[PDB]
Swiss-Prot record, chain A:
The modification Phosphothreonine is found at residue 417. The modification N6-acetyllysine is found at residues 483, 486, 649, 728. It comes from Homo sapiens (Human). Changing residue 559 to Q: Does not inhibit interaction with RHBDD1. Increased interaction with CAV1 and UBXN6. Impaired autophagic function. Defect in ubiquitin-dependent protein degradation by the proteasome. This is Transitional endoplasmic reticulum ATPase. GO terms for biological process: aggresome assembly; ATP metabolic process; autophagosome maturation; autophagy; cellular response to arsenite ion; cellular response to heat; cellular response to misfolded protein; cytoplasm protein quality control. Its EC number is 3.6.4.6. Changing residue 505 to A: Impairs catalytic activity of RNF19A toward SOD1 mutant. Does not inhibit interaction with RHBDD1. Changing residue 293 to A: Does not affect methylation by VCPKMT.
Length: 740, 490
């Protein structure tokens, strides 16, 4: 018809297996309501009946499409479908649905009331003939095929019908695949990297003939890496099985497990077999087993194997319908002659996930688990700092095995055997989650983390003008390069905080990285000391390579004065005013691109004994005095700390605010900690006294703090900063020369 | 190709190399090409097995045994000259040496002119922008950049517009152009810059970019430009020319600009070495790098070699008291030893620079070495107005503003201070203009009458309220000691 009814498929955000979400101007163009019965026609004359729903997440012309119904239509991602309303659907009297025997194995008991009757209630579901849907439960996920309906050829189902499920399972026909093949639905986290790998490879695989009409070379050597266990083979096979090409898998240890000429014949026949079924993808994992760093290679057959791989990958420039993906452990653990132009050009890091990614990975792995009601995935989302996803698979399987181990093993073996009806009753508790998270958790990470921070501007009290002109200093030229191009001034890229210790030096950097949606990689002082004492400075280049790879980002140096204080004070050691790591930092600083959005933030508390070679233009040049807090900042900081804890309202904090002057913010965030420790000790002792009183039940004495704890904490209080350091810093206010 | 010859067995590789040289003998005249020589003949210490030395000896015999023939010629290509076996590049085997090097902005413009030949650009695309904004790239990155922008123009418009209705032909490929937005997008992300090493190019700053300092410029022109054009006069009067010059002065007086102007006017290459390079060669105790630098310098003939912050190695191990040592170090005497052992006429002219002329080693002030001393003083008011206009020529400024008030007020100021105060005022003006822009946007709309494209007296007055001198008086007296005393030989 060539009208807007020809639409492009996508992934779905909805979690029902038969609903389709669409946008508002599109749905106002088609004149429907919510919950209408809609019909989809695609390729090879297949049909889909669905419920339509409305969402603003959809764009102008796309369709949020589920995987089981897109495999029901026998189409894939990148195909076009046709949309028609079918508003004349009645109810049925008999429903014929039956499994395929290849996915129901080990199963005993009745199948009908355990799955079908928990499914076909309360959801009027549109079913057409020959359809295969998918349900979960029983620690499993089973698909189901329908055969016959009374209102031919489709109906909507309701509580007011029956389903006749009689018969034996039927073998799967030759055309479709199973649904235990992995896909785009079961990879939690790292959505941007998946989008980048999706957009980089879509054209020569979905439209191969276009590059048979245009001679422009696509990128063919694309290399992803990451710390191990993160499922690089999983995402590789997911992209290859989702976009629909021929797959073949070369693993490094198997090729090293043969003789010499047998390995040569294996690699040659593998590349010929990948040539035969074009278009196709090819995958080499554990490249460290095949082509290591050259200094770590000692024999003779290994260099011959690496030269064989170089000739075999240079000799497929003529072909353009295969593409090579590979996976190592680290980019510094490959031979440097391999990753060059014509062999391996594109580079992508997977990285470790974060709390949102951990929540999504946990949402993947409790899909067919049948949780309880008291289990709280936000708890084990926030309490699981520093983990990879295979540890999360181990954690979920460990909690499931603990629920099998405590109740229902010895309860059942004394009387009967085990079926799936009692597997329906099995849920797991949060106690097994806390038990599997307390012990038996080998945390597989000690390295540097990269994430967006969470502290916002309202978490720090006051300091308002400094926040707004820092916002001027970073936020402006990334949004308006035309004004700077008009006035010809290149922007500065350095800023140097300084101030007395204990004034909240990390919080403003966290707020700037959180508001502009920037990554964050921090380096403390102890990292500088363990890079100085070991005399190892081939690590700074790795840090700034990671920084450029995490573009955009803000790089935070904490305790820069440690290397100048460590070898003596202001007299110092026998040396002078320079060192090793700081000039290595300058040399790797000034030799990079101006527009790459890597913004370097330094910090110290001793601004006099620092090397003045860092205050050159083109480097760190912006100085901001961070002073002691004032009383309005004191009440603001005190409320911003006390917002987490339950406090009383009759207590008054302006007495101590008007009393305490010249105090660090760290002191006024530890005195509340001291008072709350005193209150928690008082409450637990009154708890054990009322327990031992009549019983040798819960009327809580107080959930908050009174004036007594604050008065005793002020009797335990202490200032942290002397007056002479304030005069040493106000020397810079009196003198004002700060260029060099 | 090297990897293919290493991909066989031993006698098969021998038969392959022998049949290759016989086949190159058959169709004389012909050329022959061996790339990735690092795969065939590496450095000898990195070779460990047995068949590799046999292969290298086979190559040496096979190239010595074609001296009788004269109708073939061998060209080869490695990665680095320090990564070949040293027994290979000798007389009778490999005599001539030529560096390709990295291109520059003119070369980048020409390479981009190569790769948009059949591209059908738009009208708004500006190749000068991505010529000047692409510092530090090789040409394969430029091929990747042009193909990436073309793939982005295929990815945004015309993929999903076309697949919903019809198929793809070339009549719609005629309508396809690319925009500059895809160029900025492919240049912002997905640009692995493949270079960190030293660059060699002609500079662009001319004599009019620095204000005043006229007599010093003309007798420096006497010092460098004269004997390359008139060797007959020096041969007549028998004096060999000096080849060293030592700038010195207080910090912040434009020390790099005169060196850039001399290298730009006489059409000379330029290789500079800052102070941090001297510190990372001293602390690591690695001095097999100076010889590489002067080999690159002789290979870049003619050129001018610039040392910046020479006083870093004398200040780094203590001040004028120093460390436990004395008045010498390691890198500077290595510099002297590689300096005096080279040809007089090779047009390698060495320019040194410091800001502390007293604590430097006086062994460098010998004849046949750096001997010419030029006091670079503080700017004067005519140099102040000249330097201020030479900085402000880039920015749009108003004409009713007057700069001679602050010029007659500011005395004893560095040129760096009077090129950052304009930067501070223009940051203040760009903040004022962007806030008035967002206020007029949020005023009636919650269209473009520009309030001001230039600077008024208010920004300069506030920048003078934020102004600061950078040099004290006692350092001027410490330098004018050399004017009062005048002994400067050793
Ligand atoms: N509102 C606040 N005001 C001040 N400090 C705060 C505030 N909120 C949190 N902090 C604490 O301040 C820390 C930031 O370090 P900061 O206290 O400024 O350095 P420092 O204490 O002066 N030097 P040091 O403690 O030895 O590393 C954070 O880690 C918090 O523990
Ligand atoms: N007309 C000018 N007069 C003075 N300085 C200028 C002028 N034009 C540019 N400059 C700046 O002067 C710099 C040259 O270094 P220079 O300022 O002489 O060394 P220095 O500032 O005294 N010592 P340092 O800044 O610590 O490396 C250039 O990089 C420019 O930023
Ligand atoms: N983010 C994740 N999503 C889904 N599964 C994961 C994830 N991370 C780890 N896994 C599981 O951990 C295992 C590790 O992946 P694998 O391909 O074996 O990596 P490697 O071979 O490098 O250890 C996989 O079998 C996968 O099922
Ligand atoms: N200056 C240039 N002019 C034209 N093409 C270039 C240029 N630089 C790089 N290329 C492209 O980059 C690729 C790299 O050249 P190549 O011969 O493969 O070098 P190597 O094998 O040493 O990487 C070539 O295919 C070439 O088309």
């Amino acid at each position: 018809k060539n009208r807007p009814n020809r639409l492009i498929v996508d992934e779905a955000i909805n979690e029902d297996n038969s609903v389709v979400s669409l946008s508002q101007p599109k749905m106002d163009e088609l004149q429907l309501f919510r919950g209408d019965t809609v019909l989809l026609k695609g390729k090879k004359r297949r049909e889909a009946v669905c419920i339509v729903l409305s969402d603003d997440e959809c764009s102008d012309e796309k369709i949020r499409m589920n995987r089981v119904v897109r495999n029901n239509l026998r189409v894939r991602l990148g195909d076009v479908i046709s949309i028609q309303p079918c508003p004349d659907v009645k109810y049925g009297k008999r429903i014929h649905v039956l499994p395929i025997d290849d996915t129901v194995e080990g199963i005993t008991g009745n199948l009908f009331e355990v799955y079908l009757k928990p499914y076909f209630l309360e959801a009027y579901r549109p079913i057409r003939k020959g359809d295969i849907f998918l349900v979960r439960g029983g620690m499993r996920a089973v698909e189901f095929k329908v055969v016959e309906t009374d209102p031919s050829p489709y109906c909507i189902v309701a509580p007011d019908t029956v389903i006749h499920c009689e018969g034996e399972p039927i073998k799967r026909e030759d055309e479709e695949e199973s649904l235990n093949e992995v896909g785009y639905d079961d990879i939690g986290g790292c959505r941007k990297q998946l989008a980048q790998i999706k957009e980089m490879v879509e054209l020569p695989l979905r439209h191969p003939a276009l590059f048979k009409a245009i001679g422009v070379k696509p990128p063919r050597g694309i290399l992803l890496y990451g710390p191990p266990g993160t499922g690089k083979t999983l995402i590789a096979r997911a992209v290859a099985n989702e976009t629909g090409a021929f797959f073949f898998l070369i693993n490094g240890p198997e090729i090293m497990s043969k003789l010499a000429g047998e390995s040569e014949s294996n690699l040659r026949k593998a590349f010929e077999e990948a040539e035969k079924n074009a278009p196709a993808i090819i995958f080499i994992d554990e490249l460290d087993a095949i082509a290591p760093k050259r200094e770590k290679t000692h024999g003779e057959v290994e260099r011959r194997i690496v030269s064989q791989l170089l000739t075999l990958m240079d000799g497929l420039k003529q072909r353009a319908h295969v593409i090579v993906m590979a996976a190592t452990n680290r980019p510094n653990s490959i031979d440097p002659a391999l990753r060059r132009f014509g062999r391996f050009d594109r580079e992508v890091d997977i990285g470790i996930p974060d709390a949102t990614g951990r929540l999504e990975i946990l949402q993947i792995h409790t899909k067919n688990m049948k949780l309880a009601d008291d289990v709280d995935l936000e708890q084990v989302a926030n309490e699981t700092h520093g983990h990879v996803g295979a540890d999360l698979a181990a954690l979920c399987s460990e909690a499931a095995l603990q629920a099998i181990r405590k109740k229902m093993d010895l309860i059942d073996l004394e009387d009967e055997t085990i079926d799936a009806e009692v597997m329906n009753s099995l849920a797991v508790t949060m106690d097994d989650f806390r038990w599997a998270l307390s012990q038996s958790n080998p945390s597989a990470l000690r390295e540097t983390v990269v994430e967006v921070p969470q502290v916002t501007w309202e978490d720090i009290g006051g300091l308002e003008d400094v926040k707004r002109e820092l916002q001027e200093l970073v936020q402006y030229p990334v949004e308006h390069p035309d004004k700077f191009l008009k006035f010809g001034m290149t922007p500065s890229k350095g800023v140097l905080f300084y101030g007395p210790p204990g004034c909240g030096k990390t919080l403003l950097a966290k707020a700037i990285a959180n508001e502009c949606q920037a990554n964050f990689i921090s380096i403390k002082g102890p990292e500088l000391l363990t890079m100085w004492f070991g005399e190892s400075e081939a690590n700074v280049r790795e840090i700034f390579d990671k920084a450029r790879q995490a573009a955009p980002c803000v790089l935070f140096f904490d305790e820069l004065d440690s290397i100048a204080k460590a070898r003596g004070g202001n007299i110092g050691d026998g040396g002078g005013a320079a060192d090793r790591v700081i000039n290595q930092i300058l040399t790797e600083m000034d030799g990079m691109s101006t527009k790459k959005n890597v913004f370097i933030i330094g910090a110290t508390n001793r601004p006099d004994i620092i090397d003045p070679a860092i205050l050159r233009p083109g480097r760190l040049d912006q100085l901001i005095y961070i002073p002691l807090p004032d009383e309005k900042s004191r009440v603001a900081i005190l409320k911003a700390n006390l917002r987490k804890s339950p406090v009383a309202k009759d207590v008054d904090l302006e007495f101590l605010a008007k009393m305490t002057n010249g105090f660090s913010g760290a002191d006024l965030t530890e005195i509340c900690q001291r008072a709350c420790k005193l209150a928690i000790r008082e409450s637990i002792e009154s708890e054990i006294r009322r327990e031992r009183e009549r019983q040798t039940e819960e009327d809580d004495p107080v959930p908050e703090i009174r004036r007594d704890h604050f008065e005793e904490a002020m009797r335990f209080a202490r200032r942290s900063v002397s007056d002479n350091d304030i005069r040493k810093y106000e020397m810079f206010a009196q003198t004002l020369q700060q260029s060099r």
